[PDB]
DNA sequence: CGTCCGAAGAGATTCAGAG
DNA sequence: CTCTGAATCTCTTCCTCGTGTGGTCAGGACG
RNA sequence: GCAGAGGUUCUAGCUACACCCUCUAUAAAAAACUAAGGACCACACGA
């Protein structure tokens, strides 16, 4: 009864079943803002029954609590209005069942809806790692004023835009809105309403909605760009910038401070993430939240307008694919004949077959990619012009909305070698793509890897849960007790090198970390950075300008505080743009940040200088 | 030729490849196994009689009295399937066994018995399988899934790697009996053979050989080849054969007859071996050092005194050589040892072995098996002979013996069940050879090694357990009791064996609870093969290699259909064509292949058998003369795909669909979609819920008809004939004269089951599929069961689907559904929930069933009757009282909150001896009248059929037609006929008719007695009231919607019909799906399915237009003929000219809603064929139509993909999931939620949630969840009072769970205290 | 009516080569 | 001859929340 | 309203989480009203 999962500790002390908890499936509800979530009427009624009883007694409608319960059972009209009052400003916690990381549970300001399903705002669903497939989230209701205020200040979604694991925002557009933004931020060499000048974003939107001018067409527009260079002030810059109608429409959405360079590009998923990060760093949290909600609305609307449908004809089989397969067949036949004559051993024969099949796979992949993006041709008022593809599959892959290049290869190009359960590569790869008919033996070889991957996912989540538990338990004995440790010693930080291009630049590693010692400019005996200053975005960019190589950095290990970790030694919390607040639990944050990717983690001479220097 | 239902609607069939074998009866596995199990077998193998013959000696110890089995019969079940289901009693056939007891006169076993005693004893109540293949155990259907367990035999596991941490391989051999004690032999890292039995401590493997009474010298002879040394004056010249020289370097120069062949320190050449053989000299000079390394093979004793010069298996030394020379023995025997291959493993393990005699070995074995007990010589001998040499305690099955011999490569197939000494020594030799290098370790994952244990074998094993326990009891009783005192009935007790069988059937890991929501689910669950179960791998102990699909699973179990979750791959379903061998190994039908012709005859091949042969690809083109048009065809010979020549091929796949199961095959375009998505889709299909009306799948595999026919839900006509009468309750067929029996055939009557609850709370309703006067052929679908349309399994309703993002309402997997879907009730699914209120005998008086309840509204009481039970057919909502029950001094059953439905029927069961209430009496009398009327109508229908058969015969014999009319209808015997065979037939029919009148009155009386007698109830209850709620579940936001291809998503919003996008034709799309899902999860088939459904609906629309306007039958005829032709050649080649032009109109009437299309699983329609199908209709060949926004009205750029797709509503509805609760009843740990349950309670805030709050700067809310919300009684009460007061204040207190922990630690004797 | 009969690794615990 | 480093033998879990189904010491008669 | 009982209803209602009035040894002019207790193991399924 004491030890084990069934033991009283883990069952009833560490994690306790709680009251005021509601569970239901998830729904998108795009109309909701970021802090608001849909909540069924009956679910809010059941969850908020004590508050409803108290408000009923205060109103005088029911003299006794028993009368209030009878009123609730009758479900009369006055009960609904009372439920509206309590729900209006009382945050509730939305919590996905596997709470891998800190963002697993986030508060929301409930909005009463007619239905039986909870609606979660689309942007945060990526942060919740929640799909819309019978996924269910527990809904807990804070009771005390301390609790409601606590949820509003911390647990609420708008309060934590940045994931604790890394400074990159976690509410980044994921599937539909990113696709719509990519569709808006694209250029077609010939389209309706091309080559005309536009007064501003308002005129661009008016032209598109009227339909006389196409959504994506290169047009010179006037934009009022605002700069944050002025200290706590915005300065307007007016210029004629060549762009598409879609980009000009998108510009009115973004806040003033952000420059036009970010929206001028195609705005892939990484581009939108960088846009949100820059908005957070420059404009602040509230403009970032408003911009995120507005960008989600615009992405949804213009994706619906786009109608980026997936179709069989959308995928294209390479014309060179059959010839490549024939050439590979000739090569494998020659290697087989060499094996028969005994010129090549069985092992080297198998290795050569695998290598040439992989080379043919890469060739057919390149041919498929060229048939996707390069093959698209439409005139530029002249004879012929070549442009980037508007094919739906290539839009989905390139924008980063869904899938990757490898999956596009699997759909249209040759699938490639599929491994046997032992891990050894099968000699004969799956020639047919997923679009064409697939052979029975080919399907068997594929399902080998599929079942292997499913079992790997099961063991991955099991071991990831165990690792997260161990990480938390070695963690949680660390809080920020002391504001400043005042220790000179710290770890040296240099860009990581494995012999190739640097995996991580020095700036990203040193970002958010307080220097252990005052670093020096390349000019000798110059104090480029003071000893104890925190490294913000502008400061780090300045460090990139001077191109420093090694920066001594305060580390939690170097911190000598007893039973605690210095705030300056820890550095930026990464939850929000400042030095970590005193007292916050670094240990559990870090343990969850490490444990969370565990599911994504898989279960299983001479020296040449890259560049002159 | 086409059956009439096939004529009513014929699926257009793609796929050029013909099938040589029709799909077998899907439920043939379970039905055939149980049929073998119960069938009387004079041969007495693999049956109940086999178990009886195996265990009935019943020989009294020295009492000279024994009971011998003679025969066993299964009496007819007391209750029918419907009656036992409604009553809750198991559907069981009473087992009465005739047993004969004979008493030998004392002191003379050879003397004949003094007397013979004959009697029939009813022992055990055994469940009987229904025709559908499901046992009814407690009024709920149960089918025991077949168990995939490692077959008995000897197996060799490499165990490479992790053992010894040095990369060495540790070979082990396991002899696994079917029932008994495992025998395992293991190689140590030191290479000593150790034996471990039943996971005991490792013991030297030689010890058993001592227990085998084999002498040490005989052991060394068995496991080594003796090398002879002759005492010679020329320094002990030794007889050497060149064969032993191979594989070893020459430690010494080898010279014979003055010629040295291999020099000192020179590797021995095979040429040197051949030269020495050519010389052929037995004796070769050897030095003293070589014999020193050798080991003496057998004991040598001095002749003078008898003392042993050299101990057996003792290392030689120079002084030992001097002593043996002193002995002067001419023959000296030495073991052969080859370091490269022939290791002397027996020698070292013998040195390790501490026992030199049989008795000491037996003592050590007894100590290992029974530590803590003093060893006894006789006891140890009995223990060993019982462990391995006794049939009763150790048994190897016939399949086990065959696998054992095949692994040991012995010639004989069948042998003795008992393990024998020769078997053990052969196993050790095989293991030693494996260690040497000869042979290879077999794979446990190889499906040839893993047999399928069907329900029959498991029932036989449990019955044998009951029989052996009963046998021990009867042996104890018979010796004690005096002979001839009592008839041999009381000695046999039915209770132990009956309890064992009932325990196995009701409560077992393999006795899964039936999932009856879909006919596909019903067939899949019966066909399901599970590695879990008794005598099988558990989920945790299951290794990774077991879960992964081995290449031999091809055509035997479906690699696609495996349940995802804790048990992945362990529960893989049986493939469609697979059939179990008599030994239990899986067999796949394979076409015999002549060198140039694919011969039509099919030979079933086991997993081990297919390894020897080469099997052709299913997707291999045939010239129709049997020749492959391709000179080189891909094949699977050794489990790996490889090109092969035409002549090399020895076997060909029976069909393209043999690899996938019944569930997986139903997914169209299975070759096009990803394996993971196919797995998920096949899982989702079993979870679909039947709709109010079944709708045919416009795009289908073509196996839907087979699934519907083979499933038990569909009522199929036993004998073909015309339907004189069709009704919703019942269907009556007038049997054809040819197909009807010559006598007593009558006319067939079928009673369709109306709306009844399932094990998954889904309605089962057979709706008649034929009309009055419609001929029905043999083996034809009569009425459509759940999720069935025209004999085609129709799980869900297909509808127009458009792939496009719609303002994010279909974000990543979400699904948008039009208001039109709700309006026409396409996904409205009838859900039947049964609520039971039981009157329990209690202290202070029994609880009453009266209508009057203290402190209730009169309006609620109005719905109930006078007796206190809700009126049948009444409408009730959440919170209402269904039946009024008062606690002794309130306990009235109430509708669960949220549930709203109408009561289909109320059944009340009352114990014998307690008076039935007024409503119960009314229900009983109504049941009596209903059963009597149904029975009498059946009798008069049979009378009508009997007269009709007789009426046709009265024409012969001179009987006038008018004279017949005056004579009474009931009896026609009075009219005389000329004597003939027909006259005798009429006389026999008349006598049988009188006997049937008597049988009819007797059966009516018996049914009355069955209804009249009060139903048996659990002790402590007076009567049980069962009320069934029928709830119609409208499709609702949050419901789970899943296609067949695996795209699963919830319905985000019920968009209005006007808001929905519409094409230029003006039809709004019913469902809007997210295209972005398609590239990420490569279920590209759903897009191809969408295009094919679009083509089908286009053809259907053209046919409907041709039907809306009055059109010539010839025009529709030629149009449908063109549609069925469709360019590329197809197997069907259906001809419209055969149709009578009246069947054409009905076929078009069926086709107008949609055109069924049959797509083979792996030979399905190609893209070119789909394009041609679109071109045949008016619809674009591109498959994408310009679509106009419902709200804005502007047509979308980049025209979207719109087409009809099959979509299944999953039973995972939102209303069942929704569980919000403020406060609920607590547990004994006082944790208020009391577990997440359908009964009100709260969700768990587990460890990871607490970590999440801790990572946040959140502490107060965590403190609430820990104390004031969950387990602080004072805290909870004060919090509730404060909240209702409006002031939200918190008092921490201490969690009651913490005090529980403190008290539990105190109970351990550890002082834990709270410092002040 | 009351009343007595695989698997992975860590740690302890043998274990054993070598002066 | 007494420990050395090694090989063997023994604890200790091995995700995390739902929703439905079923099965669970059993004293037994006697003063 | 804090220890009990009575009252107009309906056996009993003294705050039991609980609904009205009276007083410290005595029972009625009076309408809205009433109930606080219960586990594990297996199977299947969703994530
Ligand atoms: Mg999900």
CB-based contacts of A592, cutoff 8 Å, min separation 6:
A100, A101, A102, A164, A468, A471, A472, B1251, B1252, B1255
C-alpha A467: how far from chain center = 23
DSSP secondary structure string, A47-82? HTHHHHHHHHHHHTS-SSHHHHHHHHHHT-HHHHHH
Residue keyed to tokens 């057996």? B312
Distance CA B364, CA B361 (A): 5
Chain B nearest C-alpha distance from A120 (Å)? 11
Nearest-Å Rg of the Cα atoms of chain A is: 29
Total residues belonging to chain A: 613
| CB atoms near residue A154 (< 10 Å) | 18
What's the token pair of residue B798?
Answer: 């297909």
What's the token pair of residue B1067?
Answer: 């039809």
DSSP state of A225: E
Looking at strand D, which nucleotides approach a protein CB closer than 7 A? 7-10, 12-24
Cα dihedral A406, A412, A417, A423 in deg (nearest 10): 50
DSSP state of B512: P
What's the token pair of residue B907?
Answer: 């059944």
**A20, HSE (Cβ side, Cα atoms, 13 Å):** 24
Q: At what angle do helices B675-686 and B519-527 cross, to 10 degrees?
A: 110
Extended beta strands in B282-390, E state: 283-284, 300-301, 308-310, 331-335
| CB atoms near residue A365 (< 10 Å) | 22
CA-closest candidate to residue B462, choices B758, B48, B1073, B762: B48
**Chain A residue numbers touching B1192 (CB-CB < 8 A):** 305
Distance CA B294, CA B336 (A): 8
What's the token pair of residue B1299?
Answer: 């005090």
Cα dihedral B559, B561, B564, B567 in deg (nearest 10): -70
Smallest Cβ–Cβ distance between B1082 and the set A20, A304, A410 belongs to A410
Handedness of CA B1035, B1039, B1040, B1041 (dihedral sign): positive
Residue keyed to tokens 């002249």? A382
Q: Which residues on adjacent β-strands are paired with residue B113?
A: B104
As separate numbers, helices (DSSP H) first and strands (DSSP E) second, chain A gives 22, 10
| CB atoms near residue A432 (< 10 Å) | 18
What's the token pair of residue A203?
Answer: 């005129």
| CB atoms near residue A122 (< 10 Å) | 27
Q: What are phi and psi of A50, to 5 degrees?
A: -60, -40
Distance CA A317, CA A324 (A): 12
CA-closest candidate to residue A373, choices A388, A395, A392, A362: A388
SS (H, E, C) B1015-1031: CCCCCCEEEEEEEEEEE
- Would you say B431 and B171 are in contact if contact means Cβ atoms under 8 Å apart? yes
Q: What are phi and psi of B499, to 5 degrees?
A: -65, -40
SS (H, E, C) B718-769: CCCEEEEEECCCEEEEEECCCCCCCCCCCCCEEECCCCECCCCCCCECCEEC
Q: Do A448 and B808 touch (CB under 8 A)?
A: no
**Chain B residue numbers touching A154 (CB-CB < 8 A):** 1256-1258
Distance CA B525, CA B571 (A): 10
Handedness of CA B1261, B1262, B1265, B1267 (dihedral sign): negative
Q: At what angle do helices B918-951 and B981-1012 cross, to 10 degrees?
A: 180
Distance CA B170, CA B162 (A): 10
What's the token pair of residue A604?
Answer: 């299983």
- β-strand pairing of B65-74 with B92-104: antiparallel
DSSP secondary structure string, B987-998? HHHHHHHHHHHH
Distance CA B599, CA B590 (A): 10
Q: Which residues on adjacent β-strands are paired with residue B793?
A: B788
| CB atoms near residue B186 (< 10 Å) | 20
CA-closest candidate to residue B770, choices B752, B788, B782, B787: B782
Q: What are phi and psi of B92, to 5 degrees?
A: -135, 145
Distance CA A525, CA A520 (A): 7
Distance from CA(B1224) to C1'(D18), angstroms, rounded: 18
Helix (H) or strand (E) holding B592: strand B586-593
- Would you say B1082 and B673 are in contact if contact means Cβ atoms under 8 Å apart? yes
Cα dihedral A390, A393, A399, A400 in deg (nearest 10): 180
What's the token pair of residue B1311?
Answer: 């002082």
Q: How far is CA B536 from CA B148, B149, B585, B843, in A?
A: 8, 5, 16, 47
Q: What are phi and psi of B95, to 5 degrees?
A: -105, 105
- Would you say B656 and B1160 are in contact if contact means Cβ atoms under 8 Å apart? yes
C-alpha A349: how far from chain center = 44
Q: Measure A155 CA to ligand 1 centroid, in angstroms.
A: 23
CA-closest candidate to residue B647, choices B616, B618, B620, B610: B616
Distance CA A331, CA A353 (A): 8
CA-closest candidate to residue B345, choices B199, B201, B173, B181: B173
**Burial group, residue B1174, by CB count within 10 angstroms (0-12, 13-18, 19+):** buried
Distance CA B1077, CA B815 (A): 11
DSSP, collapsed to helix, strand or coil, labels residue A233 as coil
Q: Do B671 and A439 touch (CB under 8 A)?
A: yes
Q: Which residues on adjacent β-strands are paired with residue B503?
A: none
Kindly state the greatest CA–CA separation across chain B.
127
- Would you say B932 and B1004 are in contact if contact means Cβ atoms under 8 Å apart? yes
- β-strand pairing of B1062-1063 with B1187-1188: antiparallel
Distance CA B478, CA B495 (A): 18
Nearest-Å Rg of the Cα atoms of chain B is: 39
| CB atoms near residue B1177 (< 10 Å) | 20
- Would you say B768 and B150 are in contact if contact means Cβ atoms under 8 Å apart? no
Q: Each residue of A366-403: b (16+ CB within 10 Å) or e?
A: ebbbebbbeebeeeeeeeeeebbbbbbbbbbbbbbbbb
Distance CA A336, CA A468 (A): 50
- β-strand pairing of B1062-1063 with B1071-1073: unpaired
**A534, HSE (Cβ side, Cα atoms, 13 Å):** 16
- β-strand pairing of A136-140 with A21-27: antiparallel
Experimental technique used?
Answer: cryo-EM
Distance CA B1295, CA B1282 (A): 19
Q: Which residues on adjacent β-strands are paired with residue A26?
A: A118
**Chain B residue numbers touching A434 (CB-CB < 8 A):** 672-674, 1082, 1084
Residues of A at the annotated binding site for Zn(2+)? 485, 559, 566, 569
Q: Phi/psi class of residue B1062: alpha, beta or left (left: φ > 0; alpha: ψ in -120 to 50)?
A: beta
SS (H, E, C) B232-279: CCCCCCEECCHHHHCCCECCCCEEECCEEEECCCCECCHHHHHHHHHH
DSSP, collapsed to helix, strand or coil, labels residue B696 as coil
Q: Which residues on adjacent β-strands are paired with residue B1198?
A: none
Distance from CA(B953) to C1'(E4), angstroms, rounded: 97
**B687, HSE (Cβ side, Cα atoms, 13 Å):** 20
Distance CA B86, CA B77 (A): 15
| CB atoms near residue B1303 (< 10 Å) | 10
DSSP, collapsed to helix, strand or coil, labels residue B452 as strand
Q: What are phi and psi of A564, to 5 degrees?
A: -160, 170
Kindly state the greatest CA–CA separation across chain A.
101
Helix (H) or strand (E) holding B53: helix B48-54
CB-based contacts of B579, cutoff 8 Å, min separation 6:
B24, B28, B29, B586, B587, B588, B589, B604
What's the token pair of residue B169?
Answer: 């391989």
Extended beta strands in B1183-1228, E state: 1184-1185, 1187-1188, 1200-1205, 1207-1209
Residue keyed to tokens 């699973």? B553
Cα dihedral B383, B384, B387, B392 in deg (nearest 10): -70
**Chain A residue numbers touching B1084 (CB-CB < 8 A):** 312, 315, 411, 434-435
Extended beta strands in B861-959, E state: 875-876, 881-883, 893-894, 901-910
- Residue B271 contacts strand C, CB under 7 A: no
DSSP, collapsed to helix, strand or coil, labels residue B448 as coil
Distance from CA(B164) to C1'(C9), angstroms, rounded: 14
What's the token pair of residue B585?
Answer: 């190994």
DSSP, collapsed to helix, strand or coil, labels residue B85 as helix
Question: How much helix, strand and coil, in percent to the nearest 5, is found in chain B?
Answer: 30, 20, 45
Q: At what angle do helices B1247-1255 and A586-595 cross, to 10 degrees?
A: 120
Looking at strand E, which nucleotides approach a protein CB closer than 7 A? 10-11, 17-19, 32-47
CA-closest candidate to residue B89, choices B463, B506, B497: B506
SS (H, E, C) A180-248: HHHHHCCCCCCCCCCCCCECCHHHHHHHHHHCCCCCCCEEEEEEEEEECCCCCCCEEEEEEEEEEHHHH
Helix (H) or strand (E) holding B523: helix B519-527
- Would you say A43 and A83 are in contact if contact means Cβ atoms under 8 Å apart? no
Distance CA B606, CA B552 (A): 10
Sheet holding B172-176, edge to edge: B153-157, B172-176, B183-187, B193-197, B203-204
Distance from CA(B360) to C1'(E47), angstroms, rounded: 60
Q: Which long-range contacts (CB under 8 A, 24 or more apart) does A160-163 make?
A: A160/A102, A160/A103, A160/A106, A160/A575, A160/A576, A161/A276, A161/A280, A161/A285, A161/A288, A161/A289, A161/A292, A161/A576, A162/A280, A162/A574, A162/A575, A162/A576, A162/A577, A163/A101, A163/A103, A163/A127, A163/A574, A163/A593
- Would you say B442 and B449 are in contact if contact means Cβ atoms under 8 Å apart? yes
- Would you say B1035 and B827 are in contact if contact means Cβ atoms under 8 Å apart? yes
DSSP, collapsed to helix, strand or coil, labels residue A502 as coil
Q: Each residue of B306-332: b (16+ CB within 10 Å) or e?
A: eeebbebbeebeeebbeebeebebeeb
Q: Do B1251 and A99 touch (CB under 8 A)?
A: yes
CA-closest candidate to residue B298, choices B308, B310, B312: B312
CB-based contacts of B583, cutoff 8 Å, min separation 6:
B151, B398, B399, B402, B451
- Resolution in Å, one decimal place: 3.7
DSSP secondary structure string, B812-862? SS-EEEEHHHHHTTSS-EEEEEEEEEEEE--TTSPPB--S--TT--HHHHH
- β-strand pairing of A21-27 with A118-119: parallel
- Would you say B1070 and B818 are in contact if contact means Cβ atoms under 8 Å apart? yes
DSSP, collapsed to helix, strand or coil, labels residue A301 as helix
- Would you say B245 and B273 are in contact if contact means Cβ atoms under 8 Å apart? yes
- Would you say B1305 and A73 are in contact if contact means Cβ atoms under 8 Å apart? no
> What are the residue ranges of helices labelled H in A94-185?
122-128, 145-150, 176-184
């Amino acid at each position: 009864m004491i030890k084990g999962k069934q033991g009283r500790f883990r069952q009833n002390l560490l994690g306790k079943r709680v009251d005021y908890s509601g569970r239901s499936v998830i729904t998108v509800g795009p109309y909701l803002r970021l802090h608001q979530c849909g909540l069924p009427k009956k679910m809010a009624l059941e969850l908020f029954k004590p508050f409803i009883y108290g408000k009923l007694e205060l109103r005088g409608l029911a003299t006794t609590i028993k009368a209030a319960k009878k009123m609730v059972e009758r479900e009369e009209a006055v009960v609904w209005d009372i439920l509206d009052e309590v729900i209006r400003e009382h945050p509730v916690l939305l919590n996905r069942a596997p709470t891998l990381h800190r963002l697993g549970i986030q508060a929301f300001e409930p909005v009463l809806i007619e239905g039986k399903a909870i609606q979660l705002h689309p942007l945060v669903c990526a942060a919740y790692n929640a799909d819309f497939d019978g996924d269910q989230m527990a809904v807990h209701v804070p009771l005390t004023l301390e609790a409601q205020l606590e949820a509003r200040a911390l647990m609420m979604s708008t309060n934590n835009i940045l994931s604790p694991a890394n400074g990159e925002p976690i509410i980044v557009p994921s599937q539909d809105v990113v696709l719509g933004l990519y569709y808006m931020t694209r250029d077609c060499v010939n389209a309706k309403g091309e080559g005309m000048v536009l007064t501003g974003p308002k005129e661009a939107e008016r032209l598109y909605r009227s339909g006389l001018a196409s959504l994506h067409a290169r047009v010179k527009v006037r934009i009022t760009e605002y700069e944050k260079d002025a200290n706590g002030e915005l300065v307007a810059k007016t210029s004629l910038k060549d762009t598409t109608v879609g980009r000009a429409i998108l510009w009115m959405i973004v806040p003033k401070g952000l420059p036009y360079s970010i929206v001028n590009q195609a705005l892939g998923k990484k581009a939108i993430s960088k846009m949100l990060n820059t908005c957070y760093r420059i404009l602040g949290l509230k403009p970032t939240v408003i911009f995120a909600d507005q960008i989600m609305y615009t992405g949804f609307a213009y994706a619906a307008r786009s109608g980026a449908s997936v179709g069989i004809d959308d995928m294209v089989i390479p014309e060179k694919k059959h010839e490549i397969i024939s050439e590979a067949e000739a090569e494998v036949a020659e290697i087989q004949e060499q094996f028969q004559s005994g010129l090549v051993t069985a092992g080297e024969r198998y290795n050569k077959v695998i290598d040439i099949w992989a080379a043919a796979n890469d060739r057919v992949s390149k041919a498929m990619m060229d048939n996707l993006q390069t093959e698209t041709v439409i005139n530029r008022d002249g004879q012929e012009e070549k442009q980037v593809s508007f094919n739906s599959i290539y839009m989905m892959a390139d924008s980063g909305a869904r899938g990757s290049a490898a999956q596009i290869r699997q759909l249209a190009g040759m699938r490639g070698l599929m491994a046997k359960p032992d891990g050894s590569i099968i000699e004969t790869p799956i020639t047919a793509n997923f679009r064409e008919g697939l052979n029975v033996l080919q399907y068997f070889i594929s399902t080998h890897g599929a079942r292997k991957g499913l079992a790997d996912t099961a063991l991955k989540t099991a071991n990831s849960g165990y690792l997260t538990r161990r990480l938390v338990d070695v963690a949680q004995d660390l809080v920020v007790t002391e504001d400043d440790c005042g220790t000179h010693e710290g770890i040296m930080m240099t860009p990581v090198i494995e012999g190739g291009d640097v995996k991580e630049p020095l700036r990203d590693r040193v970002l958010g970390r307080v220097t252990a010692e005052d670093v020096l400019k390349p000019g000798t005996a110059d104090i480029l950075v003071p000893r104890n200053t925190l490294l913000h975005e502008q400061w780090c960019d300045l460090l990139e300008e001077n191109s420093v190589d090694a920066v001594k950095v305060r580390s939690v290990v170097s911190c000598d505080t007893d039973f605690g970790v210095c705030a300056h030694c820890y550095g930026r919390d990464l939850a929000r743009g400042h030095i970590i607040n005193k007292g916050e639990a670094i240990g559990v944050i870090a343990a969850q940040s490490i444990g969370e990717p565990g599911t994504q983690l898989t279960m299983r001479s001479s020296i040449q200088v890259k560049n002159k220097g | 030729v086409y059956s009439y239902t096939e004529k009513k609607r014929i699926r257009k069939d793609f796929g050029k490849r013909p099938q040589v074998l029709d799909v077998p009866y899907l439920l043939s596995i379970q039905l055939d196994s149980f049929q073998k199990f119960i069938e009387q077998d004079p041969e007495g193998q693999y049956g109940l009689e086999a178990a009886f013959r195996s265990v009935f000696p019943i020989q009294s110890y020295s009492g000279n009295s024994e009971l011998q089995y003679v025969s066993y019969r299964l009496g007819e079940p007391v209750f029918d399937v419907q009656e036992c289901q409604i009553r809750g009693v198991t559907y069981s056939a009473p087992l009465r066994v005739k047993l004969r007891l004979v008493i030998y006169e004392r002191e003379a076993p050879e003397g004949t018995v003094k007397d013979i005693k004959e009697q029939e004893v009813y022992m055990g109540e055994i469940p009987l399988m229904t025709d559908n293949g499901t046992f009814v155990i407690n009024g709920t259907e149960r089918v025991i899934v077949s168990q995939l367990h490692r077959s008995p035999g000897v197996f060799f596991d490499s165990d490479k790697g992790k053992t010894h941490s040095s990369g060495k391989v540790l070979y082990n051999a396991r002899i696994i009996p079917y029932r008994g004690s495992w025998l395992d032999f293991e190689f140590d890292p030191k290479d000593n053979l150790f034996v471990r039995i039943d996971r005991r401590r490792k013991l030297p493997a030689t010890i058993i050989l001592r227990a085998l009474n084999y002498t040490t010298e005989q052991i060394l002879d068995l496991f080594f080849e003796k090398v002879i040394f002759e005492i010679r004056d020329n320094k002990l010249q030794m007889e050497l054969v060149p064969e032993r020289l191979r594989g070893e370097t020459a430690s010494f120069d080898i010279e014979a007859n003055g010629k040295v062949y291999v020099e000192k320190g020179r590797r021995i050449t095979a040429r040197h071996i051949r030269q020495l053989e050519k010389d052929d000299v037995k004796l070769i000079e050897v030095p003293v050092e070589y014999i020193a390394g050798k080991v003496v093979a057998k004991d040598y004793i001095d002749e003078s005194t008898g003392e042993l010069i050299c101990a057996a298996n003792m290392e030689l030394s120079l002084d030992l050589l001097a002593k043996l020379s002193q002995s002067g023995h001419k023959r000296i025997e030495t073991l052969f040892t080859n370091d490269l291959d022939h290791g002397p493993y027996i020698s070292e393990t013998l040195r390790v072995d501490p026992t030199n005699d049989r008795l000491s070995a037996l003592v050590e074995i007894y100590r290992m098996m029974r530590p803590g007990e003093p060893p006894t010589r006789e006891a140890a001998e009995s223990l060993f002979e019982n462990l391995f040499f006794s049939e009763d305690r150790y048994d190897l099955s016939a399949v086990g013996r065959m696998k054992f011999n095949r692994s040991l490569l012995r010639e004989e197939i069948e042998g003795s069940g008992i393990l024998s000494k020769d078997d053990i020594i052969d196993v050790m030799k095989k293991l030693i050879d494996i260690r040497n290098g000869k042979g290879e370790v077999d794979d446990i994952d190889h499906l040839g090694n893993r047999r399928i244990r069907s329900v029959g074998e498991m029932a036989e094993n449990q019955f044998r357990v009951g029989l052996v326990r009963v046998e021990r009891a009867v042996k104890e009783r018979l010796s004690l009791g005096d002979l001839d005192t009592l008839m041999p009935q009381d000695m046999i007790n039915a209770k132990p064996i009956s309890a064992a069988v009932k325990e196995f059937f009701g409560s077992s890991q393999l006795s899964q609870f039936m999932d009856q929501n879909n006919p596909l689910s019903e067939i899949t669950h019966k066909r399901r093969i599970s590695a879990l179960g008794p005598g099988g791998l558990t989920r945790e102990r299951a290794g990774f290699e077991v879960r992964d699909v081995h290449p031999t699973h091809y055509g035997r179990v479906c690699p696609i259909e495996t349940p995802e979750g804790p048990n992945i791959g362990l529960i893989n379903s049986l493939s469609v064509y697979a059939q179990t061998n008599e030994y239990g190994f899986l067999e796949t039908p394979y076409r015999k292949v002549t060198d140039g012709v694919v011969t039509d005859e099919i030979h079933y091949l086991s997993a081990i058998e297919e390894g020897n042969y080469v099997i052709a690809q299913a997707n291999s083109n045939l010239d129709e003369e049997g020749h492959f048009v391709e000179d080189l065809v891909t094949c699977r010979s050794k489990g790996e795909s490889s090109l092969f020549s035409r002549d090399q091929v020895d076997y060909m796949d029976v069909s393209t669909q043999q690899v996938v199961s019944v569930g997986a095959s139903l997914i169209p375009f299975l070759e096009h979609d990803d394996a993971n998505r196919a797995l998920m889709g096949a899982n989702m299909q079993r979870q679909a819920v039947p709709t109010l009306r079944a709708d045919k799948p416009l795009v289908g595999t073509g196996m839907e008809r087979a699934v519907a026919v083979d499933s038990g839900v569909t009522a199929v006509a036993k004998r073909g004939g015309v339907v004189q009468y069709v009704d919703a309750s019942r269907i009556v067929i007038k049997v054809n004269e040819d197909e009807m029996y010559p006598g007593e055939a009558g006319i067939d009557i079928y009673n369709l089951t109306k709306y009844t609850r399932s094990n998954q709370n889904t309605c089962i309703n057979q709706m008649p599929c034929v009309s009055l006067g419609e001929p029905v052929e043999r083996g034809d679908v009569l009425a459509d069961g759940p999720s069935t349309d025209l004999g085609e399994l129709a799980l869900g309703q297909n509808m127009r689907v458009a792939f496009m993002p719609w303002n994010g309402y279909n974000f990543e997997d979400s699904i948008l559904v039009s208001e039109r879907v709700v309006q026409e009730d396409r996904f409205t699914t009838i859900h039947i929930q049964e609520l039971a209120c039981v009157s329990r005998d209690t202290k202070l008086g029994p609880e009453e069933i009266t209508a009057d309840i203290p402190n209730v509204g009169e309006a609620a009481l109005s719905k109930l009757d006078e007796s206190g039970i809700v009126y049948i057919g009444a409408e009730v909502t959440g919170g209402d009282i269904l039946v009024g029950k008062v606690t002794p001094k309130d306990s009235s059953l109430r509708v669960p909150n949220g549930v709203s439905g109408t009561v289909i029927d109320v059944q009340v069961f009352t114990r014998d001896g307690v008076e039935k209430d007024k409503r119960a009496l009314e229900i009983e009398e109504m049941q009596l009248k209903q059963a009597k009327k149904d029975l009498s109508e059946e009798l008069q229908i049979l009378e009508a059929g009997l007269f009709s058969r007789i009426r046709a015969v009265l024409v012969a014999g001179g009987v006038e037609a008018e004279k017949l009319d005056k004579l009474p209808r009931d009896r026609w015997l009075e009219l005389g006929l000329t004597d003939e065979e027909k006259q005798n037939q009429l006389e026999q029919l008349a006598e049988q008719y009188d006997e049937l009148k008597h049988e009819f009155e007797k059966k009516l009386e018996a049914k009355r007695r069955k209804i009249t007698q009060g139903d048996d109830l659990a002790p402590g209850v007076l009567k049980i009231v069962k009320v069934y709620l029928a709830v119609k579940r409208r499709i609702q936001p949050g419901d789970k919607m899943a296609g067949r291809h695996g795209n699963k998503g919830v319905i985000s919003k019920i968009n209005p019909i006007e808001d929905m996008p519409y094409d230029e034709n003006g039809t709004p799309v019913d469902i809007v799906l997210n295209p972005l899902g398609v590239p990420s999860r490569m279920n590209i088939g759903q897009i191809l399915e969408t295009h094919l459904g679009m083509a089908a609906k286009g053809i259907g629309d053209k046919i409907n237009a041709m039907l809306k306007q009055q059109q010539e039958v010839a025009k529709l005829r030629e149009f449908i003929q063109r549609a069925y032709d469709l360019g590329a050649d197809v197997r069907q080649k259906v001809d419209l000219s055969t149709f009578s032009d009246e069947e054409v109109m009905r076929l078009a009437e069926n086709l107008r809603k949609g055109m069924p299309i049959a797509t083979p699983v792996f030979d399905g329609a190609k893209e070119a064929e789909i394009k041609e199908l679109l071109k045949l209709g008016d619809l674009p060949t591109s498959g994408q139509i310009r679509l106009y926004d419902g709200r804005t009205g502007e047509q979308f750029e980049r025209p979207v993909t719109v087409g009809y797709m099959y979509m299944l509503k999953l039973n995972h509805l939102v209303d069942d999931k929704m569980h919000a609760r403020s406060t609920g009843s607590y547990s004994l740990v006082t944790q208020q939620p009391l577990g997440g349950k359908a009964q009100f309670g709260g969700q768990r805030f587990g460890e990871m949630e607490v970590w999440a709050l801790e990572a946040y700067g959140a502490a107060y809310t965590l403190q609430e969840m820990l104390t004031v919300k969950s387990d602080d009684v004072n805290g909870r009460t004060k919090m509730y009072k404060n909240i209702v007061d409006g002031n939200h204040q918190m008092e921490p207190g201490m969690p009651e769970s913490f005090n529980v922990l403190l008290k539990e630690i105190r109970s351990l004797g550890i002082n834990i205290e709270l410092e002040d």
